[PDB]
Symmetry: D2
């Protein structure tokens, strides 16, 4: 009710859905209705697909450099409208302006810029077979792909998913989280203004698994779409360790997939470490995310808050020691918002629920260990295997330890800057591996292998 009703984006313009049904997007800072948002119907999905199939033909028919300049123009518009997009994202997600202004759009534009540069670097192979025959391969666009948005980093993930897809000559239909639909629409406007052909990037808003499900079932849509340990070794700089543990747990109010929510500390260092974390947590600046001085906002929604409070209650019941936080923040204007205080449990155990399960809120679990191998064994003892980190002054030891840790992303004496080829939100590494940029593009193309026979054809018949 703050903004006019949000409509579907198909064919370079907004169009009315065919379901007559809507949902609300709520500012988590105050419970205010930001906008009513239209639910795409199945008919509307078909409409987006046909728009996208035709649009993709125009896009693919352009030269590589033509596509590249168009995407580079979208980058420009993104950087000009950075503060405006951030403010909108802050309203929708609850994330502090200090985060959204310096991370979400910035890194998003950066990856779009990066991929735009690789568009003219997509080529195939030639393979000699014999004097009278050879093979050449062509990399062709998939056609139409679908992208499913995240609620923690809406615009960043929209950029992360659409950039390689569009760069590889595909159209994308994007469905943002129902929790956070606003910036995705803004993104689509920007693509259109930058010269991206109609239907190349359509946005379908929808709730529950339905709109996502229709994209999945549609035969013309070619493609679709942690409890990380932090081990503090005995020779760690404890100030660095506490800064890392705090950043790893409370940035974006703990709503990051790669968060280091299981913090292993050696028995001999437990007392000092707890005191240092305590000190850092007490000076966290929780507040209204529209205040530039806030560095810790409310959670993304009320139902998520209730879920986090459920986990915290689980931690108390299971006899984890509560070091700080542990409740909803309700004084002042906070009581109308979805605020959970930065929470830390210690003396945890591996069978505890707060330790086994992803919480996706500001809840750190501190676990005590006695020897190095034990800690690594326990760090690995999980279903997930997303990220891991070690803190130590001995790099030979760190080197040894990361060989033994079963995780795709490993941090040594830092945390949070995730590999550039991974569609996970938060800090992103300001540099990409050539092969990962090119391998990612390669995922959005299919290979055709053409064998040319120049000689006689042999038949056994």
């Amino acid at each position: 009710a703050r903004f006019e009703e949000q409509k579907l984006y198909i064919g370079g313009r907004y169009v009315e859905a065919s379901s007559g049904a809507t949902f609300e997007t709520i500012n988590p800072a105050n419970g205010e209705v930001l906008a009513k948002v239209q639910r795409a119907s199945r008919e509307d999905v078909e409409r987006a697909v046909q728009s996208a199939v035709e649009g993709q033909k125009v896009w693919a028919a352009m030269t590589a450099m033509q596509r590249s300049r168009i995407l580079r123009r979208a980058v420009d518009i993104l950087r000009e409208r950075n503060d405006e997009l951030a403010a909108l994202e802050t309203l929708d997600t609850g994330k502090p302006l200090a985060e959204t202004r310096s991370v979400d759009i910035v890194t998003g534009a950066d990856v779009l810029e990066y991929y735009a540069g690789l568009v003219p670097a997509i080529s195939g192979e030639q393979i000699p077979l014999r004097e009278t025959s050879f093979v050449y391969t062509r990399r062709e666009p998939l056609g139409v792909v679908a992208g499913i948005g995240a609620w923690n980093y809406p615009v960043q993930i929209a950029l992360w998913k659409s950039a390689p897809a569009l760069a590889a000559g595909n159209a994308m239909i994007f469905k943002p989280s129902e929790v956070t639909p606003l910036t995705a629409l803004k993104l689509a406007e920007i693509y259109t203004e930058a010269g991206v052909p109609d239907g190349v990037f359509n946005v379908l808003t929808g709730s529950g698994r339905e709109v996502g499900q229709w994209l999945t079932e549609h035969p013309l849509i070619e493609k679709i779409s942690g409890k990380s340990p932090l081990i503090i070794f005995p020779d760690a700089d404890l100030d660095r360790a506490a800064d890392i543990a705090v950043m790893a747990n409370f940035f974006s109010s703990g709503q990051v997939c790669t968060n280091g929510t299981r913090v292993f500390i050696h028995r001999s260092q437990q007392a000092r470490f707890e005191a240092k974390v305590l000190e850092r947590v007490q000076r966290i600046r929780l507040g209204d995310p529209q205040d530039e001085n806030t560095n810790f906002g409310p959670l993304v929604s009320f139902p998520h808050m209730e879920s986090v409070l459920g986990y915290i209650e689980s931690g108390k019941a299971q006899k984890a020691r509560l070091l700080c936080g542990g409740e909803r923040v309700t004084d002042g204007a906070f009581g109308k918002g979805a605020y959970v205080a930065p929470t830390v449990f210690t003396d945890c155990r591996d069978d505890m629920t707060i330790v086994r399960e992803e919480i996706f809120g500001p809840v750190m679990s501190i676990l005590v260990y006695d020897d190095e191998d034990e800690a690594i064994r326990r760090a690995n003892d999980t279903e997930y295997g997303l990220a891991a980190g070690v803190v130590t002054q001995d790099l030979a030891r760190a080197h040894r330890a990361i060989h033994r840790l079963e995780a795709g992303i490993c941090w040594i004496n830092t945390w949070g800057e995730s590999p550039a080829e991974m569609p996970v939100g938060g800090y992103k590494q300001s540099g990409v591996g050539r092969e990962n940029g090119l391998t990612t593009l390669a995922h959005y193309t299919r290979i055709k292998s053409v064998q040319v026979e120049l000689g006689d054809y042999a038949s056994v018949f």
Copy 2:
């Protein structure tokens, strides 16, 4: 009957299954029971997994070049035993020895040889972030992976799947098709004899879907078409007929990539049919162990029954039966699963034999009037595995092939498939560097390591 009971292969040796159950593998040339074969139980899966987990650590702890040398030793053994493995494959599958001796083991050994030489090249990336920080990557083995066998090219596909997986430092648990389980056990023996550590290549036999599911569900286990052939009016028709015949009757039509929808221009239909007929009439159907045979029985009696059902459907929908169309029962052939080479013509796009994959020796000939129409109809299908054109014109050959929607494309030939695709049959004698490297990457995972050497910054 012919051979002793076949056991499970776990840990560098044969071991007893714990199901108390067996199935038979049958010689399709004469219907004799080749062997009773043990069924793996769920506990036998668990046993194979623990063996594999431990074997993989020994394997992965070796250098890439150490593994490569071992794999090359298996290559050397495979070439020595080529003829013997070929004859066994012919017993189990019915495929002519002339094929098995020159294709199945030769190309499988080739691909093992290829990955052994390529793997030590693989390195990681290093990426500076700023003066005090950098990230690097390394590719690591997945761990234990599962391989599911094909019935049409049992040992070739066993080699095609195990080669990159083993080269990349994984263990594989392999489950051959219940129709054709014999050669996969021989391959396991050969890996062991080559020096592959115990547990690195285990084989579990099983009937139906159960063993497959058990592998799929295991938490420690990490991981057809209706292809069109378009004959353009400027084609050499003799070459076209050669291509169409090979594309339909090699391995008795049991190839995934077969050109089972043959488009011919209306003005050339009559002459093309006569040329196909001349070639079909000299096909040498017979005992597949006889080196002079070039067309054997189908792989099994149930598969024969399914093909005969499709042939019945063709007649029912009034396709014109040009030749073949029945089981061959003369003399000793009536004891085998022999279906004559079969050609239907005057076919239409909506016919069941045209829409559905038969996996038997049934060619469908379709008439077109113009080139755009032939391309449109060729593309009008859910499948998209392979396609080919026959023409002598430079522009038309490339133009047409680029408009066809298939991943494997042939100009003026048929049948030799890219070496990076686990498709049985003839293989291209050449591999793209990127294709080879990419296949290897499917059997590895990337670990990214970021090191901060300076101060760490925090917003809190």
Copy 3:
């Protein structure tokens, strides 16, 4: 006298050369003096080099993406000034405005845009050696490199050499051809306006081979790129060729830029049975070539680049006649009207040529096509290959097998089937460029302008045999 004296370009501005010596650049269309141009001394080379050393440090300190942003701004400016730069190129080279306005700056900007986009992809390798030890690599700028220009595509080649050198983080000192020095200086201004730091692209003009020698001799110049690539490239027209397409290709392959192109197909092989029909088709096309004032956009064939080059070409034409080649058309200087004041040679075709003729054996770099008859395919290929040169080759045929088979048998690096003239980006030849670059060709080129630094780290114990 048309333009003011042209100075050296060092440190983001024009500075005086230390000698008082100058040379002239001449408009080949009318013999007029376009400008006096200063000749650099050895001291100016030192000056330019010291400037380059320092500019390069500032340039290299930026990230690859920051460099690429700046180079993209240069691209934007080049597009803005396309017509102005083309007009100037036409004055200096005598090439038709229709060519310069659509080819020279357009493709040069294209290649700058390509390398700008490609360079931020470059990463290094990490190679584990054992549990406790690894080595990693990094690519680094060479430092200061030099480039030597060509007279036939001055600005296009200046862009071709400076684009990957600069993208990779180096500085370049460029010496354009003394025949055509004007546009290189304009390029230098444009790099500066775009934000390329002072000293990163310096231009030194000079006569003869001395400036080139001083650049080579300097110890702080890491690499020098000379190209200012001989060819006597064959075009084989097979009997099943479309003869109209073949005639079109042959004339484009011989008379574009008035025949002053490294890759030209100056030996045209025709089957004996088709010689007369093919000649008639070439002659028809040659007769409608619009030779004239290059400033007129309607002109498609200009004068040669200089009077001396014209005399050299006329010398070859005299040789062809003396050796009894049959003259099909042209064969003389064009002197009617104002053309007498310019360096104009008529489009010339000899036929009944023989492999031992001088015009067949030697590169002419002028508008002189040699037509040779053959009797079979193996003979054509053998004779096409029988030459010291191995630059380009082309075939015209409608048959799928013959097209690829003949090309596979031809010993040349640049090959064309049923076309001519669009050359690979990785080749520093002027003219039409292919609208697409192989990923590997691009990175390989970038790598020529970098060096590998290799760092091995030992985290564990060190072993000594002593």
Copy 4:
């Protein structure tokens, strides 16, 4: 006189030179003549080239896997003949059998084995231009290339140069150092025995610069492969025992005859005394001796002229008042008098203007330089015309990382030394791994691109 006169190896066989001239190769351990060796003439170079041209065509006509298998067969023969080849290399070079038996042939064969595996991984590209035109590229062999040998790692360098050249489908004409020509010929026989076609690897021996020049001049030779004062900076927080082990290894391995040797050793003033005592103790237990004895780890220099050159440099250091810490003379006791033995030598309190500091010596002579601060050390380290390798020793890896950024050498070591990159034809210890886009990249340098544009549409002409 130990062996019969060595002839040229052209076209898979030994043939007589047409120069009428020979030179001698001398065993530096005892002064014995090993062999008279024929000098190739300009006419022999031509003969070798025409043999190479024809052989290369046979080699390139084979399938990629055929070439791969032949090169692998050569690897197996090299493993079989390791000890025999090592003994011969020891005779010719004076390098201890302990080195030659475990390093030279082992690592050479390792590199050939590596490249043999990549033969089938050579391929080109396809480049779309527009719907109606595309380009495909073919990687073809250059043809005939030349390799120039080095005297300090004869067989290893022969292997290092010939392996990618042959794997890429070229023929190579190889010219070993006149100081050490014997093993190159043995390698040539091994290639032939493995099935390499006649002419694909020819060997021409010669003295002076004649053969190398004639090869460079020859119009059918597409490429010639020819083969400083590297600093070792010991930071104040270095483990001095590690520092001393590295310094000693970096200076005295192969009797100091390695290209990448860290002959300028920078030590902080606060650590000079302790460091000197640690170097002294290690140097004193070096086992100088007959290189045929397995217990020897330090042999004579490669030749008598080289010894005299080294002794001249040692005289320069004394004359310029460098402080002699140890060694500093020819070892002449007993049998050693008949050989070319120079004691492991250490100068300290050196200065940057000293000849022994500024010039490369290629002998067992360490120059120790004192410094006061880290940036000064790094500056002085970079202040050399050369810029091959550098190393740092420190316990602070953050510091080491910063320092390698500032050091200008392209081969850098942190807390180690000696193992050079596996793409650089520099003898010695080698890194037991190669990054793909360098092995595969090196192969590319031995091929050229043929680019084929296919036009499927109308051809436009402005005329």
